Design a protein around this ligand. Structure first.
Ligand SMILES: NC(=O)c1cccnc1
Lengths: 110, 115
C-alpha cells in the first residue's frame, strides 16, 4: 500500500541511500548527473497484488533544495560548485509518501 | 535469483511460518496447508523494477515433509497432525530457491495459557 524505495539492481527495500558523483577538474557538477546517479541506483514503487507499480520521485527538485539549504546556487543549465557531501531527501508520493535520504559524495575535490 | 516474498507486504522472506488448525479428531488436510502457505508466500524473479512470479511445488513439498516424518496421508489428503514440522517449498528459475516453512498445529500444543 505504502510507497517504498528499492535498490534498482536487487529489488531490496531501502531506507537510506548513497551515491558518488565525480566533479570536473574545476570542482563543478551538474544536477542532471546527480539525478542520473540517484535514479539509476534507487526507485520508488507501490507494492500490491504481487506487483511493483513504479512511482516518479522528485529527484531534481530534491537536489536543488538540498544544495540551496547548504547555500549553494545552481545556474539555469544545472551547474554548481560541489561540496564534499550533501544529503538529498528524495520523495515519491502514493496514489491511494516515502522519503529516501540519499547521501551524495563528491570524492575528487582538490 | 528466485526469491520468496510475503504476498501482502512484498517483503523478501528467508524462513516462513504458518499455523493450521486440526479438526476434532486431530486430523489436518494437506489442502489446508497448501492454502495457508500459498496465500501468505509467493516466489518471483526480480528484474528491471518488475516481479515475475514463479510456481512453487507446495503440495509435493508438504507430502515429502510428511513422508520424512513417517506420517501417512490418506487418499483424500488427511493426516494425523504432529505438533510442528518444516516444509521446504521450492520454486524454479527460468534464467532456484527454497523457502523453509514451519507449520504448527496449535490445537495440539502440550503447553497453553488456557485452562
Ligand atoms: N554509489 C553510486 O554512486 C552508484 C550509482 C549508481 C549505481 N550504482 C552505484
Amino acid at each position: 500500500g505504502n510507497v517504498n524505495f528499492y535498490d534498482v539492481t536487487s529489488g531490496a527495500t531501502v531506507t537510506n541511500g548513497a551515491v558518488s558523483v565525480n566533479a570536473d577538474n574545476q570542482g563543478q557538477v551538474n544536477v542532471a548527473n546527480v539525478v542520473a546517479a540517484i535514479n539509476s541506483k534507487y526507485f520508488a514503487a507501490q507494492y500490491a497484488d504481487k506487483k511493483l507499480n513504479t512511482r516518479t520521485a522528485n529527484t531534481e527538485d530534491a537536489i536543488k533544495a538540498a544544495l540551496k539549504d547548504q547555500k549553494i546556487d545552481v545556474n539555469s543549465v544545472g551547474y554548481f560548485k560541489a561540496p564534499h557531501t550533501f544529503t538529498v531527501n528524495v520523495k515519491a508520493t502514493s496514489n491511494t509518501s516515502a522519503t529516501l535520504p540519499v547521501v551524495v559524495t563528491v570524492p575528487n575535490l582538490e
